[PDB]
Amino acid sequence: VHLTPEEKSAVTALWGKVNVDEVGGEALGRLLVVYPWTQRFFESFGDLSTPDAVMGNPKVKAHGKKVLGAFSDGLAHLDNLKGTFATLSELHCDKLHVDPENFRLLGNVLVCVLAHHFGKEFTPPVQAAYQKVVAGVANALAHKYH
Amino acid sequence: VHLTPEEKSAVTALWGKVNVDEVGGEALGRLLVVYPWTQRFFESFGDLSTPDAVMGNPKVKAHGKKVLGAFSDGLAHLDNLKGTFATLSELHCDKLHVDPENFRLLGNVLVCVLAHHFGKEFTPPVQAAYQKVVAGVANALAHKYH
Amino acid sequence: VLSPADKTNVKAAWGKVGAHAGEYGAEALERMFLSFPTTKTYFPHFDLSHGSAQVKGHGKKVADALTNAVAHVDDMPNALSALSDLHAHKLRVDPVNFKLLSHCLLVTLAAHLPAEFTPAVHASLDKFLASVSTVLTSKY
Amino acid sequence: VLSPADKTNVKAAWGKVGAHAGEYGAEALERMFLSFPTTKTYFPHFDLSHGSAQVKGHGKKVADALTNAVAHVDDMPNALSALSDLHAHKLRVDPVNFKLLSHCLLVTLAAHLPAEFTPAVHASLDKFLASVSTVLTSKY
Ligand code: HEM
Ligand code: HEM
Numbered sequence: 091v092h093l094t095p096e097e098k099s100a101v102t103a104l105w106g107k108v109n110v111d112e113v114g115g116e117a118l119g120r121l122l123v124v125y126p127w128t129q130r131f132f133e134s135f136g137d138l139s140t141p142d143a144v145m146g147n148p149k150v151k152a153h154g155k156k157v158l159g160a161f162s163d164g165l166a167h168l169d170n171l172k173g174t175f176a177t178l179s180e181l182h183c184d185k186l187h188v189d190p191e192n193f194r195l196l197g198n199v200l201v202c203v204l205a206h207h208f209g210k211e212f213t214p215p216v217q218a219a220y221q222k223v224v225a226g227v228a229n230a231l232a233h234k235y236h
Numbered sequence: 237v238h239l240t241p242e243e244k245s246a247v248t249a250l251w252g253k254v255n256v257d258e259v260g261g262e263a264l265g266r267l268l269v270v271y272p273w274t275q276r277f278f279e280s281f282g283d284l285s286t287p288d289a290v291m292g293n294p295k296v297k298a299h300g301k302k303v304l305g306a307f308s309d310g311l312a313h314l315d316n317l318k319g320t321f322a323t324l325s326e327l328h329c330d331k332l333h334v335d336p337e338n339f340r341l342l343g344n345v346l347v348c349v350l351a352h353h354f355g356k357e358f359t360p361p362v363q364a365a366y367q368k369v370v371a372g373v374a375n376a377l378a379h380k381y382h
Numbered sequence: 383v384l385s386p387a388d389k390t391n392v393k394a395a396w397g398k399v400g401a402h403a404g405e406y407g408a409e410a411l412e413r414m415f416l417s418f419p420t421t422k423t424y425f426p427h428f429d430l431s432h433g434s435a436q437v438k439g440h441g442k443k444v445a446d447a448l449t450n451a452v453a454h455v456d457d458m459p460n461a462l463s464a465l466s467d468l469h470a471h472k473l474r475v476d477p478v479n480f481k482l483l484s485h486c487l488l489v490t491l492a493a494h495l496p497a498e499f500t501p502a503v504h505a506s507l508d509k510f511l512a513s514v515s516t517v518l519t520s521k522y
Numbered sequence: 523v524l525s526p527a528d529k530t531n532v533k534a535a536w537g538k539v540g541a542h543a544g545e546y547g548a549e550a551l552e553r554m555f556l557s558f559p560t561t562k563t564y565f566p567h568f569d570l571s572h573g574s575a576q577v578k579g580h581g582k583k584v585a586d587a588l589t590n591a592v593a594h595v596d597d598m599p600n601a602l603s604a605l606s607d608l609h610a611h612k613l614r615v616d617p618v619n620f621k622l623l624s625h626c627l628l629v630t631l632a633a634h635l636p637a638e639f640t641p642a643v644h645a646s647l648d649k650f651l652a653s654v655s656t657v658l659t660s661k662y
């Protein structure tokens with residue numbers, strides 16, 4: 091997908107401020123809490139009975155770290171998200187059979203986490219840039235369904 | 237998208253029996269009737285106040301003919317739906333701003349029309365083949381959003 | 383909000399389906415598994431091949447739930463409460479999947495009732511299935 | 523089905539937003555138009571640039587509808603009936619678009635209420651906005 095230079099700017103600048111050890115876990119947790127059917131794929135994670143259990147669950151934080159890893163990679167290759175996500179697409183589509191609508195949901199959750207963490211700095215134009223990004227990632231991740 | 241030879245077979249064989257002057261209009265009408273917000277894009281068509289008005293509307297039938305035309309074209313180029321639909325994608329996305337979810341809906345409506353018209357011949361495996369097809373068309377038509 | 387005309391349309395289609403309902407339920411399931419293979423993940427202990435006695439038996443259950451919704455169309459939330467709990471709490475069924483099954487149910491009706499599947503009845507059925515789906519996803 | 527805890531969460535967020543509600547409503551609209559440009563088609567007679575007095579005025583209307591839903595959360599279908607008719611019959615608003623606006627509303631709250639946007643309240647708000655959206659798309 092194609093971001094303008096002003097959008098690439100808006101995106102990369104904010105992303106440099108992201109705590110890569112935290113935000114992934116924060117987004118994965120909210121996904122599990124806000125869209126509970128997603129918990130279906132994470133039963134091995136243990137206690138997920140309450141929001142506090144989810145967010146303080148050490149497996150959630152550790153696995154979230156990997157998830158953000160991929161988003162970071164995608165940010166690194168905006169003009170080739172398809173190649174970047176080929177392997178993850180095989181995993182999520184052919185192996186796990188996750189419905190691709192949840193790729194969109196996780197992207198939107200991440201956006202809410204960024205908004206929360208950056209507040210006023212997460213302006214409407216900055217969000218718009220990020221929306222192109224998470225949409226591009228969901229589409230690439232869903233390639234094996236297409 | 238990739239159909240097996242058995243699926244290509246299932247698809248092309250049925251499609252040869254389709255009345256190309258009728259089915260397009262039948263599917264467009266149902267789209268307008270079942271998902272009335274789509275009428276938003278077709279106000280120039282005139283009377284759409286009732287299902288009977290929609291289905292007997294001569295503009296609906298004529299424009300449906302063109303719509304099926306494209307599906308036929310897509311059936312002709314399964315392994316390159318993206319190139320086939322480039323122009324239509326510019327039109328539907330950049331010009332008209334139709335939400336791509338309605339591309340999926342029209343495909344599903346077409347599937348219901350085929351089922352109706354072919355009955356028992358429209359078997360579960362045949363439908364599955366057609367589902368890959370209409371999904372491939374919706375994805376190609378939505379390329380300009382991606 | 384189903385209209386009085388929607389109610390009669392759905393009732394009429396239901397009536398015409400008659401005692402095939404269970405068999406049509408099984409067929410809708412099969413069409414779903416084949417067309418949308420992701421849905422199969424929810425039935426890992428089912429054999430889903432053609433002719434499966436499990437899919438047959440389950441299709442009747444599904445059909446039975448739908449007829450119960452038809453027969454209590456003015457209070458679906460109450461009629462389907464136990465089933466909505468099951469689908470959300472215990473099974474954790476992804477909301478997208480209700481659209482997939484609803485489509486397969488329409489296809490099945492369409493492939494069996496040529497006289498009844500008019501554009502109007504098609505609309506009424508889709509609304510009916512969307513309302514059932516709304517109830518069954520109301521409990522997450 | 524909103525839980526008692528959801529109700530208090532939403533009420534609490536609402537309370538904290540306070541008299542900014544109208545201004546946050548305008549902001550949610552802007553975020554929507556910029557992030558999801560297809561939605562702009564519905565406001566062809568609006569100037570949608572930053573600072574537009576029209577978007578400001580409309581945001582208050584939107585906020586006002588939401589607070590009315592909050593204040594009558596146990597009977598949203600009745601409270602929002604006139605608005606549901608408008609959105610379905612007259613405007614013909616595509617159901618997908620309610621998800622887009624609901625997301626922008628969450629983002630806006632999140633960008634303004636750091637203490638309140640916990641995972642739990644986030645969940646409660648999303649459910650609240652989905653229920654409002656269900657009502658506003660119930661009249662096609
Ligand atoms: C933008 C969307 C997504 C991204 C970028 C993403 C990224 C990742 C990454 C990086 C991994 C680790 C891969 C590895 O261990 O080598 C993973 C694993 C996993 N993901 Fe996701 N994911 C996404 C969406 C989802 C969603 C929505 C679900 C479920 C609702 C899901 C379910 C899983 C599961 C169950 C695993 C563990 C697989 C295993 O280790 O066997 N993913 N994902
Ligand atoms: C698989 C999905 C679709 C296909 C294959 C398709 C195909 C077509 C074709 C072949 C045309 C005529 C192009 C021409 O005149 O050169 C057309 C025009 C049009 N379509 Fe579609 N269409 C699809 C989905 C939709 C949907 C869902 C909507 C609205 C809800 C829509 C709205 C329109 C409108 C308003 C026009 C007239 C444009 C104009 O002449 O200015 N399309 N489409």
Ligand code: HEM
Nearest residue numbers: 421424425443444447448473475479480483484514515518
């Ligand atoms: C029109 C919507 C639906 C209806 C009316 C329906 C109906 C039913 C009924 C009557 C049962 C048995 C209930 C019982 O034994 O107490 C059931 C169970 C079940 N349903 Fe559904 N269902 C619907 C949608 C779905 C969807 C979309 C999925 C997944 C894609 C699904 C997956 C399941 C599963 C996994 C079971 C349990 C099967 C077992 O382990 O025996 N259902 N459903």
Ligand code: HEM
Nearest residue numbers: 561564565583584587588613615619620623624654655658
């Ligand atoms: C949370 C969901 C929504 C709420 C609470 C809401 C609220 C409102 C309210 C209060 C009005 C003014 C009503 C009146 O004057 O009687 C309005 C009008 C309108 N809404 Fe919405 N709305 C929602 C979703 C949407 C969406 C998703 C769209 C389109 C993408 C939309 C498009 C419009 C349009 C085009 C008008 C008329 C504006 C005008 O011509 O003045 N609304 N809405």
